[PDB]
Ligand binder design. Structure first.
Ligand SMILES: [Zn+2]
Ligand SMILES: [Zn+2]
Lengths: 397, 98, 48, 397, 397, 397
């Protein structure tokens, strides 16, 4: 993997730096690296593809070195370099695709394609150059057995869920108390509703809880907490828990009372925020617990009081909600966020070449299933394929 | 690696391989003897140059044999007039000129 | 038990020995199972 | 860590090999190792302790090399060697305790004590000797990211949990169906009970299931499976689920039929045993699923017909049980078990020196909490402290 | 076999001794042994696998000797050695698996794989090293026809057997005298019951006897004998011997009387313990005879007298039980104890590679069947496979 | 003792390392040690036996040295070495048996047999080698008056005691309060029973205590604490304290509340756990005090309320239990345990050769009596015999 990254990095640097008119002092080191790569790759034979519709390709390297004696590069030098660069880039592209399209239930972190297995050999260690990208450096740190971290903007850490729980319920669904929620991507919207507006509750306060556990620990997370669940603030016709019938939800929104948001690690409160909305920081957590109360307004103007009678007919249902968005975070394990395109690259390659479903990943690289059942083998394979995707994206666009 | 063998001075591995007839490639800048003799090829004279390694524990006297059989060979009639495939156990690692 | 499994501070041990309400309530709120169990034992022993 | 282990191993081999009268040919190599240890440690100052009640101690090494001119060791040689070895062993003991009493959320495996940080420098690599013991071997393997394995006799893999789940009940708790279980250490005892003895059940068969997910993947485990849970076969008075009242349990044991024990890995059935008791083998699993049925006996003698009526009053409650013990297993992670004293040593040191509760481990090294939330940071810290505990146990009796 | 063990031992020593920084004097002998192994193996080709799902692999050894360093070997030396060590370890792993998955009805001691047959040739005998492991020691002793010994913790010597015998019985199963037992693994648990409480027996004493034979003689065994059988001390509904109906067993436990435990060897009484409980020692035996009695209490308080009437209706059945557990033992044959992983390893390899059932072992390496019919050929095969399994476990976790 | 262990160790190393085909560089030092042993033992004559049926045997040593010129050991070398090794191993075995079959009230640590007395002379010190075994290491530490340590799995530390105490009693034995207990091996099962279910007890609570002392101090002990005593949860008919009559015990099990377990050393509290189950650690203790309460439930369903009336005719008797098992521990004194076989070896030798009962150990090496009265002279003799038994087991299978 380090050799493959070095190949892609060398080719990208050759594309960027070997340009007409540039001083050779600008690319002396790069050309030494390029010649070393050519020497090491010469005389070796590689095969790629053969899975799905990915064609079987054979690669042979018999290239000549690059000049090192001009003062300023000219057009001839640029074309001579580009001819070799095209072939090397194609080889790297196909090796990366072959590695992406594959998976293994045991030792998913190790190379899976025969080309990458060959590059794992000691003879190719002369191609290492630089390891400065985020994914390659995290790879090297993990191998060295040190702390790793990927920084995500809107990490898709919540498996897609949209559901409700009814604590009080009847067949007619005329008088309900409970909660509804959507956990999607990097956002949690929760809304506790009570049809009676806590008329008969002790102290006219109804308590609501919502616990969202994560599949991986998030560190140094910036979060936005806002006091209304805009998704659960309009009339709705939902289908019963067992699907038999449908019930009505005509919410009227009240302020959430006694809002507590706790970020827990190993079941212990690491961070806790009370009645505080806006930007908050969770330093280290794997569970989010949101507690909030519907408190019946002790004082009501007539227009308000008419909404909440003390008898069964309830046309307006008192709802109080919270919205929590993870803007940024750091995680030890790879995830899918809104800024990176690695998941898109892997899924696109697999779909384009019609890879049969393997023994590890879910069909279509479904991120919801993957993050729902994020297992050790899945994490290893996902990190491997994402690292290869970053290596490939260095060259292909 | 002949250089490393000479530096370390331990010939156990090469001696064992040359005694038990195990394929091996000795790597190093060596001088060779050019031999244009078909009868010398038939005599298997290229395989009789490695015993001195075992006898002396040195590899600076190793001098492989490179057969060069052409029309200007004085024995090429043996190649031309009989139905046989010239063959030699040893090969010399050399590059053709540019 | 508390000292063995939590290594309380010197000041906390001093206050607990003197039976300081501040430290006692601090532990109760911190959810120390040992202190909470002892206090619950006392409350239940206050039968009548 | 490797240097600390090497120090301990050299000192142990000195205390056992260097004995009066022994040939110097028996200890020549060991004495070379000992002299290099002394040379490398000479002129270095170390400080240990300073946390909790662990005293701050200072260590200075200025020692002479053991002699090498004798063909046999005599009393004086052993005396001088012992005088040096005592001080070295005291230093090793204090270093090990200082390392064991410390934790870190980030980089749990990295050295935490000042002494071990100093030993991690490159000048001390000269004293490395042979890493033969199980724990140091696994330490090096995980440092290189290989497959580790610890062999446990009765691994302490299940957190303590004694509970019951009711599937049929009433306010009077006089006609109940459900399961009761104790998971403890390496033993699962589960008993399904039905008060009606499947009089009204379809086919007179009541199904019971019990799913025990392990926090880590065990491999090549020998398991004893016996057809009765002795723990749930006597009369009981049990708190109700909410705790308001208590209910009566009066078991009468029948044989469990259609016993199916399935060992699963990532939701995939790896091993399955039907109506099989005694020693069975689970090669690789992380979940155990026990299925067993209570079947109403088709033919009853009068003393059994009296027991099992069709009217409501159910004096005797049919019960079918299973016991499952993990005799031995292999795990890639580190666990407390019945044969090793590493957890006991770590807990003993912490309790003896009143180490303040840290950010990683639960108070008092509570194994229930550790295993219940066995996060990767906890695993790293636990492996480090267990390795240090084994190193200490090499010397301290 | 000895050659395979020597390869494993030298590879384990190389892994555990060739570490950065160690003196060269610490590993001179090891390096000489390693280079001898390399010389002997070089030029030989091996083929492994080909049974079930075990892949066919071809092994060629073409390696250079390990070098020398003046004082302390360094990182380069360790990496260069590690490459060869990894290849050799893989080879030994595969040879051991191919040996484990094979068996022979005739000449079960003899090697069964082509790899091990080749290694048994005379050319490889120069790779022998030290045969220190317990299993290789006993292998050599058995080869020489000397007395062997394996020390087992909770030896699994009793084939699983739960049963009952009724010396007195009627169709109504209302007045039964007999004995119910469970012999499992290392435990005997036998309870003799009388429904009449010996009302009409001579001297008001009912005699019970339980004779458990063992397939293999055990020597110097520590045994725990306790005066009750908790497994047969709660109400039961038990199927009849014919399976036609079921009978009710409602025990009241009395102390066993005149408990005599006899350990017999070849029909001769070797050890006899009279009404002694706790830790006893059986020095040599192949049969256990537990003789106990139910003595009707001569004086019973009113509550007791209510339990045992003169006439027929017997609601409470007098029960007297014994429990016996073999904590440790020594056997000249091979067994599956509760602390070792050899049976688990062999079964795991067979299950993982889907080896078809052979002609020697029962399906799935079922220990109950294997120990019930522990034929001499089966013992030969089991010792062979366990020895190779221990050799493999030297190198593989 | 050190000389005897050295003889056994060098003979074992000769058995293992001196094998056909091995490099002489792997046995050079061992052969030098073997020749030193031969030189030291040559010209000497010993006598063993003469106690019980242990036959009198005479040994005279005149052996030639082993060759030192081979490049690789061949068959002749191994046969020649084996001829000497057979006689030496026979001599060591007989010396060990002769030592194990003897006692001394005063100075029992010192050698007892004439052969070991002779070996204790200085001229034999040249046969020392390396004392690496656990028992010889502890022996050397004992001689040097340092701190000893033995690690035991399931230590046999509790002197057998199955009994009951009746705090409230009547001749009719119909309204009883008290406790029953079994302390055996490493398990304490203790139940507290009240026939009135604390109907009249103050606070509707009945307190129970159970104190188990130990004859030796255990260190860093892992313990399992479970909330019920299975052994005392079924109907029983127990003899009275005087044996005049029998009383009936029909238990119904309630959870024990306010469970406290204290581990004390010299009467001072070292560890205390309140209402904590599962795995616990006792760092250093000599007495266990278990305290637990039977609380009459305040709320009861009709089935529960029928059981516990207000008046005398108590049919079901409330009981609460605890089970405390010492999984592992460390002791400065030798103990019988589940994993080791030294007690079995000593007892077996004495039984086989019919050694008359001595003045130190009880008849038949009864471990119950030995650990009930583990006097210091008994400890000295027991450590001596255990060390000799381990030395013997090094060689004899
Ligand atoms: Zn954005
Ligand atoms: Zn055990």
């Amino acid at each position: 993997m380090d050799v493959l990254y070095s190949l892609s990095k060398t080719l990208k640097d050759a594309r960027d730096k070997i340009v007409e008119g540039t001083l050779y002092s600008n690319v002396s080191d790069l050309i030494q690296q390029f010649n070393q790569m050519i020497i090491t790759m010469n005389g070796n034979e590689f095969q790629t593809g053969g899975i799905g519709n990915l064609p079987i390709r054979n690669w042979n390297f018999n290239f000549g070195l690059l000049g090192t004696t001009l003062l300023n590069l000219d057009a001839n030098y640029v074309e001579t370099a580009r001819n070799t660069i095209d072939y090397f880039v194609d080889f790297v592209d196909n090796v990366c695709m072959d590695e992406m399209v594959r998976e293994s239930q045991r030792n998913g972190i190790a190379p899976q394609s025969d080309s990458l297995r060959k590059l794992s050999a000691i003879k190719f260690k002369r191609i290492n150059f630089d390891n400065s990208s985020e994914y390659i450096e995290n790879w090297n740190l993990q191998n060295r057995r040190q702390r790793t971290g990927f920084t995500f903007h809107k990490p898709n850490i919540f498996p897609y869920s949209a559901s409700f729980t009814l604590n009080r319920s009847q067949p007619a669904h005329d008088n309900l108390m409970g909660t509804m929620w959507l956990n999607a991507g990097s956002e949690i919207q929760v809304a506790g509703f009570d049809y009676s507006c806590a008329i008969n509750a002790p102290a006219n306060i109804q308590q609501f809880e919502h616990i969202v556990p994560l599949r991986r620990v998030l560190t140094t997370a910036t979060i936005t907490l806002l006091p209304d669940a805009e998704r659960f603030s309009f009339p709705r016709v939902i289908n019963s828990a067992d699907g038999a019938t449908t019930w009505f939800f005509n919410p009227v929104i009240l302020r959430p009372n006694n809002v507590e948001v706790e970020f827990l690690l190993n079941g212990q409160i690491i961070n806790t925020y009370q009645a505080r909305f806006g930007t908050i920081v969770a330093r280290n957590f794997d569970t989010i617990r949101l507690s909030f109360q519907l408190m019946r307004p002790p004082n009501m103007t007539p227009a308000v009081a008419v909404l909440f009678p003390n008898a069964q007919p309830f046309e307006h249902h008192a709802t109080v909600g919270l919205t929590l968005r993870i803007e940024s975070a750091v995680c030890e394990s790879v995830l899918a966020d809104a800024s990176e395109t690695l998941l898109a690259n892997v899924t696109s390659v697999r779909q384009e070449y019609a890879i049969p479903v393997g023994p590890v990943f879910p069909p279509g690289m479904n991120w919801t299933d993957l993050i729902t059942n994020y297992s050790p083998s899945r994490e290893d394979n996902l990190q491997r394929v994402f690292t290869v995707a970053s290596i490939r994206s260095m060259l292909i666009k | 690696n002949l250089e490393e063998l000479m530096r370390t001075g331990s010939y156990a591995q090469i001696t064992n391989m040359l005694l038990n007839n195990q394929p091996v490639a000795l790597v190093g800048a060596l001088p060779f003897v050019t031999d244009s003799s078909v009868i010398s090829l038939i005599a298997i004279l290229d395989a009789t140059v490695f015993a001195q390694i075992v006898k002396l524990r040195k590899v600076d006297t190793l001098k492989p044999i490179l057969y060069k059989i052409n029309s200007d060979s004085n024995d090429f009639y043996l190649v031309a007039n009989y139905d046989w495939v010239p063959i030699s156990t040893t090969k010399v690692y050399k590059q053709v000129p540019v | 038990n508390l000292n063995d499994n939590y290594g309380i501070s010197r000041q906390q041990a001093f206050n607990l020995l003197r039976s300081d309400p501040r430290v006692l309530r601090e532990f109760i709120n911190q959810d120390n199972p040992i202190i909470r169990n002892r206090i619950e034992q006392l409350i239940m022993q206050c039968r009548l």
